Design a protein around this ligand. Structure first.
Ligand SMILES: OC[C@H]1O[C@@H](O[C@H]2[C@H](O)[C@H](O)[C@@H](O)O[C@@H]2CO)[C@@H](O)[C@@H](O)[C@@H]1O
Ligand code: NA
Ligand SMILES: [Zn+2]
Length: 379
């Protein structure tokens, strides 16, 4: 592997972090990596949550290449539990780590009791009041302090920092989160993102992050629409989006997936970024109703890879496999990787996912190599 020049948001990022960026720049035009939230910490078929098992592995015999987790595992009260050990195991396997940010609401987080009050899903606008000068800026800062302390101590067995793709304030073109589009002007959102990156990088000294931006899919798929709340090329390494679609009659939605992926791919080439799909799935209500699409993964890979732009995404990530679903009283299913168990055998979804795995263009953990020791230069 010969040296390549990289330009990161953090001009002082570690060599392994720079290498990860270089890796994806190359890899992305040869495969699409499979990602999974809570890959080794949540599953329907795992017997340990210590980082050694996954539903993916039990289904196809390899782990996801990209391992997603969240600030819900970092910032107090760490509702999703610590992940340091499991991150380290993933990295030691040569996996890639990404962490999203379901931050509590800085304006209302003392008021927790009746969900969703005080959480990401508390729609009370908190952007204006959380920027410097705002009354709740110290509360936001406390979250960021905890993210920085975690990152700054996230080290492998040799004492070297583990790179993370840190994704901030996602799905911001909708209004279900407190940083969303009813909660901020575009400028206020951009300031929230830039303030936060600067705080982590410059105030707290984080050196092992790449920064990802990911709005929702657009139905009017234009660069100008993506740019409206885009933080800017100085603030983003990874151009993503999230999209959740219907379980049935979904051809239009799949064309829209491909169109958004093509857009971010073209923008990423022009801007020196990595394009990804940071979160994609059948919408949770459909899965919770017991519904399924047993061609979903086959439609996904075939649509993406046929398109000359969309195929250039580095990875796509699907959400967590909740071991006991979510409350429906009863529990209802809440998972995205088909499990190796009677329900998914019988409904054809396990077969679908195994075909996705077998596809030449998908890459799972053993399919990626030389991720972190690639030589790089910076200007
Ligand atoms: O792990 C955090 C919560 O994730 C939710 O899942 C959402 C997620 O918030 C994003 O909107 C997106 O990736 O789509 C996901 C599935 O709808 C749920 O899993 C919650 O139970 C979690 O607290
Ligand atoms: Na690709
Ligand atoms: Zn190549």
């Amino acid at each position: 592997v010969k040296p390549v020049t990289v330009k990161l948001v953090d001009s002082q990022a570690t060599m392994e972090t720079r290498s990860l960026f270089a890796f994806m720049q190359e890899q992305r035009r040869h495969s699409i990596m499979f990602g999974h939230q809570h890959e080794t910490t949540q599953g329907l078929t795992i017997t340990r949550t210590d980082g050694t098992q996954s539903d993916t592995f039990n289904a196809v015999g390899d782990f996801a290449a990209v391992y997603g987790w969240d600030t819900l595992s970092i910032v107090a009260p760490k509702a999703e539990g610590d992940i340091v050990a499991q991150v380290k195991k993933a990295y030691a396997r040569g996996g890639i780590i990404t962490v999203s940010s379901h931050f509590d609401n800085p304006k209302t987080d003392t008021q927790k009791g009746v969900w969703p009050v005080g959480t990401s899903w508390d729609q009370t606008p908190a952007v204006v009041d959380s920027l410097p000068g705002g009354a709740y800026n110290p509360v936001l800062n406390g979250y960021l302090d905890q993210v920085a302390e975690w990152a700054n101590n996230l080290k492998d067995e040799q004492g070297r920092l583990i790179p993370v793709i840190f994704r901030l304030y996602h799905e911001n073109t909708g209004s279900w989160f407190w940083w969303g589009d009813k909660q901020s002007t575009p400028e206020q959102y951009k300031q929230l993102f830039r303030y936060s990156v600067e705080y982590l990088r410059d105030v707290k000294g984080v050196r092992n992050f790449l920064y990802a931006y990911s709005p929702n899919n657009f139905w009017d798929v234009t660069e100008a629409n993506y740019l409206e709340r885009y933080p800017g090329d100085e603030w983003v390494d990874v151009l993503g989006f999230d999209t959740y679609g219907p379980v049935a009659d979904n051809a239009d939605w799949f064309r829209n997936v491909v169109a958004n992926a093509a857009l971010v791919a073209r923008m990423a080439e022009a801007r020196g970024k990595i394009p990804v799909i940071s979160g994609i799935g059948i919408r949770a209500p459909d899965i919770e109703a017991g519904l399924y699409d047993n061609q979903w993964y086959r439609k996904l890979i075939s649509g993406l890879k046929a398109d000359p732009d969309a195929r250039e995404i580095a990875f796509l990530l699907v959400w967590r496999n909740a071991p006991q679903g979510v409350p429906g009283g009863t529990q209802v299913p809440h998972y995205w990787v088909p499990a190796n168990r009677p329900e998914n055998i019988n409904n054809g979804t396990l077969e679908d996912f195994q075909a996705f795995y077998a596809d030449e263009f998908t890459a799972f953990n053993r399919d990626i190599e030389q991720v972190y020791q690639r030589p790089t230069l910076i200007v």
